[PDB]
């Protein structure tokens, strides 16, 4: 039948005692955000979309940049 | 019916309850049957409890009979059913229980009939194996006890008030004492009755359901225990009830852990309830600090929040080591946890808590600098500032104090800041100014695309106005003080980008602009660091805006600077390139220095009035003729010439340009490509890399796309790459990108950039698609490093031409097989790792053709026809009967046999017949088994 009948209704005391001993499965380490300024910029300009959209040699004027972006189609 | 009325949600619960209370008074059995049927029908049971059942049968037998009559269409019971009607049902059920107790609180509850019947039925259904009943019965019992706690709290208030009166009576001394004493006795019988009912629910349902296998039931019990101890702490905040919360904090499911933390935060909001929670905090302080680094980030946020609440009530409990772990969470990648850690840091070192160094926030600014330096997790302050932005806005936006610590002299008794501390403050100030001026969080700490609200726009305007007015006067002074330091100057030169330039003309601060311009000119003439020079060039571009009236002054300054630089370059080059003599390192240092500065200004500024191509061509030409030109001069000369040709192309857009200009541009661009091709074969790797990047970029700009978009006047400027250049570019990639497996992560990003450049040329049809075979074959071997670039290239190329991509893929697999037969030789094992790895790329490539199976018929058919001919190509030199060489290759093709539509399957076998005799159809494991597989793959 579709009625959710449950044979194990509670947790075992060994499971409770084990949980009170080890808590490694539910803890974790620290995910640090880009640590250096260059790694911050690589997070912004280092993805496939940005790489296939931006020039290999940095162009700092939008007039010079438009010459490349105009050819991207 | 009661269930139907509660589900309909049309009438008020008090009317529903008062209607039932009136009915109970008439006949009790009829009313109790309806109340009993309600709990059974709120579980989803469509069965009925007859009066004969209630009068003769026991609770256990009734639950058994109701289980058998539980018609079920889905395992979904009311409280699991999703939808707004059912969300109303949950609150309606809970409210009915509360109202029933509230209305029957003074008379019916003490009759020894109703509550006993209800608690007995609820306890029985809380032991059932049907999740429907147990979940529902647990929720009812939990809500009944919250309601019963209220009557106990109200009874306690009355007894304390009654007892207060009895003391006064005996003090003032009487039938008043006798009647008051009867109230005391009556309230004691009532309080004892309620306590017995409450203990029955706690020892019959809570003690067992806090350990239920289903997490949903466990969370219901944990939520209610928090409510009870917050409501009646004088009887529920003992350790005998708190022990359950401590054990459940170690639960595997994070929903239940969240409920435990929320329950404990409710107790710490009241600072009075501290003596009781003190022993518990001591025992579980360790687990709470451990829950800060929880797999579920939501539980982590609540743990830091609870530690902040603990810090407020008692600070000594948390040791410095524990606090340190939480301080490290400011540099987290998740803003919610970082913001929670920022609040803990604010309340621990800053919140605790005249103009300038004497200002009230000076000590807090020095404290923040000291923290950044004592935490070597990050070298920039962007994430520290973002995390503490919503809490320390006053301190972060106090730029007068920060500027006074950097410019004003130390007061007597105040120790000075060291160069490291001063460099730290400049990093913190630049970061505060950036987030204020551009109201978006740093990368990773937000979407960065939120429409600003009205207050956000007003705040941005006032912040920018204040930044401009203060740093318009201070920036010149700061650059003069820290001019020699490259790191400090780089950071300081980025400030002018966040300024309202109109303030200079609306505020008559033009004398300050003259000083800013002089210091940028002074820094350029003294520094040779690429980053210092990039900053100076970009600062000038920001200042050089023709939309601002200050443009004339900054155009004069820029022109004067380039005049001096260009004049020196021309006079130095005339003697450096003199035929004969020997090149002193001093002369080359002077030349490199001036070329470096000009290259920087040429990226953002025109500089076309100062013709520099002739000078740069002579320097590069001499390197090709002599061979000893310093490497760094060659790199900067290549970059400068790129900008010269790029700035000329921008001016040609104007029809005002003659054909002499188009013809002059063509000759200049063609000469440059030949110079770049020469340095692509250079011995210095840096020169090879520079030439490749510039060539890849110039080839995209001067391609056939320069004619698209109605620019048909640029047809004479199209440059098509020759097979020689295409071969040389592929050689560089196969030697400097796919090499033999901090600086490692940097080299990765540089090699990824170089690969993207070549892949851009293949997706924009600048270079032939047959050149992608080498990159495609390196998919699996370099997947962790360049897989994304290769996958994008494969997808983009499939859109340009699926048939050509199919042929390119087969060549890559064909090439890897040739390399194995060059080493392992023709006599190789078909279980070797190399063959098995080659067989794995075929599986991945097959997966990339699946899309649009009815549209990729020609591509997959070509793949098979192209590979069939490679397998049957070199005949067996031993004999025309021994299996063909490379016949083993078709083992790699067997992978694509699935993608072929059945109709395509028949045709490819017809192609096979042309390269296979009936004699070749002999059964042997002697290398004849390989072919048998491909035949068997296509046969079915």
mmCIF file of C-alpha atoms in Angstrom, chain A residues 1-11 13 16 19-20 22-23 25-40 42-44 46 48 51-52 54-61 63-64 67-68 70-73, chain B residues 67 72-73 75 127-131 134 208-209 211-213 250 252 257 287 290 293-295 328 331 333 378-380 383 427 442-443 534 538 541 600 603-604 646-647 649 690 697 700 706 746 749 752-753 759-760 764 788-789 793:
data_model
loop_
_atom_site.group_PDB
_atom_site.id
_atom_site.type_symbol
_atom_site.label_atom_id
_atom_site.label_comp_id
_atom_site.label_asym_id
_atom_site.label_seq_id
_atom_site.Cartn_x
_atom_site.Cartn_y
_atom_site.Cartn_z
ATOM 1 C CA UNK A 1 0.000 0.000 0.000
ATOM 2 C CA UNK A 2 1.151 3.642 -0.522
ATOM 3 C CA UNK A 3 0.743 4.403 3.241
ATOM 4 C CA UNK A 4 4.223 5.337 4.588
ATOM 5 C CA UNK A 5 4.533 2.636 7.322
ATOM 6 C CA UNK A 6 7.923 2.882 9.142
ATOM 7 C CA UNK A 7 9.458 -0.184 10.911
ATOM 8 C CA UNK A 8 12.363 1.759 12.541
ATOM 9 C CA UNK A 9 10.551 4.564 14.446
ATOM 10 C CA UNK A 10 13.527 5.781 16.523
ATOM 11 C CA UNK A 11 17.339 6.019 16.403
ATOM 12 C CA UNK A 13 21.494 4.367 21.351
ATOM 13 C CA UNK A 16 23.176 8.552 19.394
ATOM 14 C CA UNK A 19 26.937 11.101 17.047
ATOM 15 C CA UNK A 20 27.956 12.476 20.491
ATOM 16 C CA UNK A 22 32.309 12.042 16.154
ATOM 17 C CA UNK A 23 30.943 15.162 14.366
ATOM 18 C CA UNK A 25 30.706 14.270 8.821
ATOM 19 C CA UNK A 26 28.758 17.472 9.693
ATOM 20 C CA UNK A 27 31.733 19.918 10.017
ATOM 21 C CA UNK A 28 33.969 21.344 7.202
ATOM 22 C CA UNK A 29 36.938 23.655 6.428
ATOM 23 C CA UNK A 30 37.034 27.352 5.385
ATOM 24 C CA UNK A 31 36.444 28.515 1.745
ATOM 25 C CA UNK A 32 38.604 31.692 1.559
ATOM 26 C CA UNK A 33 37.600 34.398 -0.986
ATOM 27 C CA UNK A 34 40.225 35.517 -3.575
ATOM 28 C CA UNK A 35 43.271 36.183 -1.314
ATOM 29 C CA UNK A 36 45.444 38.321 -3.652
ATOM 30 C CA UNK A 37 44.285 41.236 -5.858
ATOM 31 C CA UNK A 38 45.405 39.362 -9.025
ATOM 32 C CA UNK A 39 43.310 36.292 -8.036
ATOM 33 C CA UNK A 40 40.329 38.652 -7.485
ATOM 34 C CA UNK A 42 41.193 36.440 -12.460
ATOM 35 C CA UNK A 43 37.852 35.557 -10.787
ATOM 36 C CA UNK A 44 36.348 38.473 -12.800
ATOM 37 C CA UNK A 46 39.256 34.380 -16.004
ATOM 38 C CA UNK A 48 35.346 31.079 -20.489
ATOM 39 C CA UNK A 51 38.089 35.006 -22.102
ATOM 40 C CA UNK A 52 36.188 34.472 -25.416
ATOM 41 C CA UNK A 54 37.807 40.104 -24.070
ATOM 42 C CA UNK A 55 41.182 40.689 -25.862
ATOM 43 C CA UNK A 56 44.366 38.736 -25.012
ATOM 44 C CA UNK A 57 46.302 42.033 -24.654
ATOM 45 C CA UNK A 58 44.459 44.406 -22.255
ATOM 46 C CA UNK A 59 42.887 47.417 -24.055
ATOM 47 C CA UNK A 60 42.239 50.315 -21.601
ATOM 48 C CA UNK A 61 40.218 52.585 -23.984
ATOM 49 C CA UNK A 63 37.340 53.095 -28.573
ATOM 50 C CA UNK A 64 40.305 50.688 -29.068
ATOM 51 C CA UNK A 67 37.539 47.443 -32.675
ATOM 52 C CA UNK A 68 37.782 43.919 -31.113
ATOM 53 C CA UNK A 70 32.842 44.683 -33.216
ATOM 54 C CA UNK A 71 34.538 41.583 -34.759
ATOM 55 C CA UNK A 72 33.073 39.170 -32.133
ATOM 56 C CA UNK A 73 30.082 37.875 -34.164
ATOM 57 C CA UNK B 67 -5.217 1.765 9.835
ATOM 58 C CA UNK B 72 -4.995 6.121 0.376
ATOM 59 C CA UNK B 73 -4.441 7.684 -3.093
ATOM 60 C CA UNK B 75 1.569 8.631 0.625
ATOM 61 C CA UNK B 127 3.510 5.253 18.819
ATOM 62 C CA UNK B 128 1.895 4.210 15.498
ATOM 63 C CA UNK B 129 4.087 3.087 12.549
ATOM 64 C CA UNK B 130 1.996 5.195 10.090
ATOM 65 C CA UNK B 131 3.932 8.441 9.489
ATOM 66 C CA UNK B 134 2.587 9.938 14.222
ATOM 67 C CA UNK B 208 10.405 9.115 22.432
ATOM 68 C CA UNK B 209 9.769 11.423 19.407
ATOM 69 C CA UNK B 211 14.731 10.451 18.663
ATOM 70 C CA UNK B 212 12.359 9.744 15.720
ATOM 71 C CA UNK B 213 13.923 8.399 12.497
ATOM 72 C CA UNK B 250 25.051 16.637 17.271
ATOM 73 C CA UNK B 252 23.273 14.500 11.253
ATOM 74 C CA UNK B 257 20.425 21.452 14.150
ATOM 75 C CA UNK B 287 30.248 22.208 19.706
ATOM 76 C CA UNK B 290 32.548 23.792 15.696
ATOM 77 C CA UNK B 293 32.302 25.677 10.157
ATOM 78 C CA UNK B 294 29.159 23.568 9.398
ATOM 79 C CA UNK B 295 28.535 21.849 6.024
ATOM 80 C CA UNK B 328 38.790 33.935 10.325
ATOM 81 C CA UNK B 331 37.324 36.340 4.759
ATOM 82 C CA UNK B 333 33.302 33.229 0.286
ATOM 83 C CA UNK B 378 44.332 37.751 2.835
ATOM 84 C CA UNK B 379 46.773 40.416 1.481
ATOM 85 C CA UNK B 380 43.955 42.814 0.385
ATOM 86 C CA UNK B 383 36.471 41.126 1.929
ATOM 87 C CA UNK B 427 44.481 49.419 1.174
ATOM 88 C CA UNK B 442 33.392 42.577 -4.278
ATOM 89 C CA UNK B 443 33.573 39.551 -6.609
ATOM 90 C CA UNK B 534 49.233 51.527 -15.868
ATOM 91 C CA UNK B 538 44.296 55.167 -16.520
ATOM 92 C CA UNK B 541 42.022 58.874 -19.096
ATOM 93 C CA UNK B 600 51.378 52.623 -21.090
ATOM 94 C CA UNK B 603 46.983 52.010 -24.571
ATOM 95 C CA UNK B 604 44.473 54.613 -23.270
ATOM 96 C CA UNK B 646 45.025 50.213 -33.495
ATOM 97 C CA UNK B 647 44.716 54.023 -32.957
ATOM 98 C CA UNK B 649 42.191 52.106 -37.493
ATOM 99 C CA UNK B 690 54.175 38.512 -26.326
ATOM 100 C CA UNK B 697 44.617 40.034 -31.340
ATOM 101 C CA UNK B 700 40.956 39.150 -35.082
ATOM 102 C CA UNK B 706 36.204 44.409 -40.101
ATOM 103 C CA UNK B 746 49.431 32.153 -12.057
ATOM 104 C CA UNK B 749 45.883 31.588 -15.815
ATOM 105 C CA UNK B 752 44.554 29.511 -20.199
ATOM 106 C CA UNK B 753 44.696 33.055 -21.723
ATOM 107 C CA UNK B 759 40.520 29.057 -29.739
ATOM 108 C CA UNK B 760 39.003 32.510 -30.507
ATOM 109 C CA UNK B 764 35.776 33.189 -35.612
ATOM 110 C CA UNK B 788 36.331 24.523 -20.116
ATOM 111 C CA UNK B 789 38.166 26.347 -22.979
ATOM 112 C CA UNK B 793 35.636 25.693 -28.566
#
